[PDB]
Amino acid sequence: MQHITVRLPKKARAMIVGEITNVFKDKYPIADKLKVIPEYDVIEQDLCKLLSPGFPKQPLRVYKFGSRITGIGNRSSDLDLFVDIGNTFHTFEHRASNATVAKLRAMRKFFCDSEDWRLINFIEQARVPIIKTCHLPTGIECDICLNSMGFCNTNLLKYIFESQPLTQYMCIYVKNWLERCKLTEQISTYSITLMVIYFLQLQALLPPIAMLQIEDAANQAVLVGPWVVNFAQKSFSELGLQQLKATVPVIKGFLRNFFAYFAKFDYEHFLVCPYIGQANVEIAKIERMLHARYSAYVSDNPECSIQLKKPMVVQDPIQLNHNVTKAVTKYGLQTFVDYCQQTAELLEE
């Protein structure tokens, strides 16, 4: 029923009307602490010990990433691990290749046989196939992949969150909001993180990612396939962006404005575009605004262009052909919009 608002779930409502301090009192210090704990070194070492014998002629490196590493995790969060066997970091796979699937299938057996690991699921169909497994000595659930792109995203978020901590507080809040709204099947934590980033770029509080990726005499791209995955780690002082101290009042006001903005966004004509970082980025124009490697990649691979004929378009700022909200349905978008509207209303002073 499109003429009736979807009602905000009571689990979300109680948290929104509740003091925002309660949101963070335990959550931010926990998330900060979980960026680095000694358990992760045990996991990394155990993973290398387990898998190295099985790939004895190749270099092996483990890259940890995800919400724990960026600073928005909690004690139940999974740890994402990219296992790079044979210098595959710089190889881009739109859909996993046969050779990648074969490596993942071989790795599954190691976790299966090992007493130190419980195999939870082997997810082969996914866009990013993963092994979900529990590291039993620590009890931390680990998502093992063979794709470097999520790790690259994590390093960009770390820079963003460390430079402008308001972003981190906002992302902790909206992650919890998504969960209480029961929206995570359609809108991921990473998708709403990119929405927070884009919103703050419009406030001149974060740089466009394209700005951080100028290719000139002093700066060369790190490429994963056609994607530029590095960025200049410029101080915000040098970028001319102010660095705010996140207080409860500042956070609440930015959250109010965030939800109001996405309640009234025109998803039919515009996309959320942290690459460009400017207002009103048109769906009709975005593909002509990307770097030349995007055009060359899609020219050679026309089935791999960004999916724009979708209710909700949120573009990954590194993997520019990925609409991270491509699975949002018309009703799912209406639900999100209605929840944003009601949340902004409840955050008014």
Numbering used by the authors: 201 to 549
Task: Provide the authors' original text about this structure.
Terminal uridylyl transferase (TUTase) is one type of enzyme that modifies RNA molecules by facilitating the post-transcriptional addition of uridyl ribonucleotides to their 3′ ends. Recent researches have reported that Drosophila TUTase, Tailor, exhibits an intrinsic preference for RNA substrates ending in 3′G, distinguishing it from any other known TUTases. Through this unique feature, Tailor plays a crucial role as the repressor in the biogenesis pathway of splicing-derived mirtron pre-miRNAs. The structure of Tailor contains two canonical globular domains separated by a large catalytic groove, which serves to accommodate the 3′ ends of the target RNAs for the post-transcriptional addition of uridyl ribonucleotides.
The overall architectures of Tailor in all models are almost identical and resemble the previously reported structures of the other TUTases, belonging to noncanonical nuclear poly(A) polymerase of the DNA polymerase β superfamily. The catalytic domain (CAT) of Tailor consists of a mixed five-stranded β-sheet (β1–β5 strands) packed tightly by two α-helices (h2 and h3) from one side, exhibiting a typical folding of the DNA polymerase β family enzyme. Three conserved catalytic aspartic acid residues (Asp278, Asp280 and Asp 343) sit closely with their side chains all pointing outward from the other side towards the groove. The central domain (CD) of Tailor, on the other hand, is made up of a long α-helix (h1) and a core region of six closely packed α-helices (h4–h9) which is a homologue to the central domain of PAP. The juxtaposed CAT and CD are physically connected through the linkers of h4–β5 and h1–h2. In addition, a highly conserved loop, which has been previously termed as nucleotide-recognition motif (NRM), also exists in the CD of Tailor. Although the overall structures of Tailor in apo and RNA-bound forms are highly similar, careful comparison did reveal a structural perturbation, upon the RNA binding, occurring on a region next to the exit of RNA-binding groove, which is mainly constituted by H294 and R295 from the loop connecting h2 and h3 (L23), R327 from SSL loop, as well as N521 and K525 from NRM loop. Specifically, in RNA-bound structures, the portion of L23 loop (H294 and R295) and SSL loop slightly shifted towards each other upon the RNA binding, forming a direct hydrogen bond between the side-chain of R295 from SSL and the main chain atom of Q325 from L23, which is not observable in the apo-form structure of Tailor. In addition, the side-chain of H294 forms two direct hydrogen bonding interactions with Q519 and N521 while H294 also forms three water-mediated hydrogen bonds with N347, Y500 and N521 using its main chain atoms, in both complex structures. All these H294-related hydrogen bonds were not observed in the apo-form structure of Tailor, reflecting a higher degree of rigidity for this region in the RNA-bound structures, which is consistent with its B-factor profiles in three models.
